[PDB]
Amino acid sequence: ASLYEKLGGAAAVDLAVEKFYGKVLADERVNRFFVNTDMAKQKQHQKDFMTYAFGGTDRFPGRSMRAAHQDLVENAGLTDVHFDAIAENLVLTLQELNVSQDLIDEVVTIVGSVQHRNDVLNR
Ligand code: HEB
Ligand SMILES: [C-]#N
Numbered sequence: 001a002s003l004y005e006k007l008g009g010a011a012a013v014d015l016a017v018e019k020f021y022g023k024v025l026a027d028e029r030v031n032r033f034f035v036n037t038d039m040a041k042q043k044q045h046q047k048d049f050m051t052y053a054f055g056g057t058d059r060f061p062g063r064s065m066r067a068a069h070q071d072l073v074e075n076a077g078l079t080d081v082h083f084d085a086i087a088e089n090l091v092l093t094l095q096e097l098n099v100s101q102d103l104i105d106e107v108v109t110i111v112g113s114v115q116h117r118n119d120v121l122n123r
Helices: 004-009 010-025 039-053 065-074 078-094 102-112 112-120
Strands: none
Touching: 004 010, 004 102, 010 039, 010 078, 065 102, 065 112, 078 112
């Protein structure tokens, strides 16, 4: 079925997003971007987005990646080194949880891609 399902569905995704943001909040390279962010709500939005991205829901939720991040590009100096850190954090999350490499590579095809980078970084 969906990648979402093979990952273990709503509760696994929830877990991974929690673990993911633990790392992000503990990562000096990027954590300043969330210093004013309501994190329960961010985790919810991130769980929404991934639930869709992994084929678990039938319509794009919330803001486009480009629009969600345009302010950080314009004001907060967001760029490659920040993108790389976020994607590396996500992969570390799934590796530590020992998700199979097949499934992680698939995830990375979505969240590591140049497509996503260029949306986020507004290029
Ligand atoms: C690519 C790895 C990437 C994804 C998939 C992503 C996801 C989100 C989502 C779903 C939101 C909320 C969207 C909505 O409002 O509906 C979102 C907002 C924020 N992001 Fe990211 N993000 C990705 C990439 C990055 C990188 C790199 C960042 C560097 C720190 C980063 C940060 C943030 C922040 C601060 C917000 C909040 C913006 C706000 O309005 O509060 N994101 N992102
Ligand atoms: C963006 N988390």
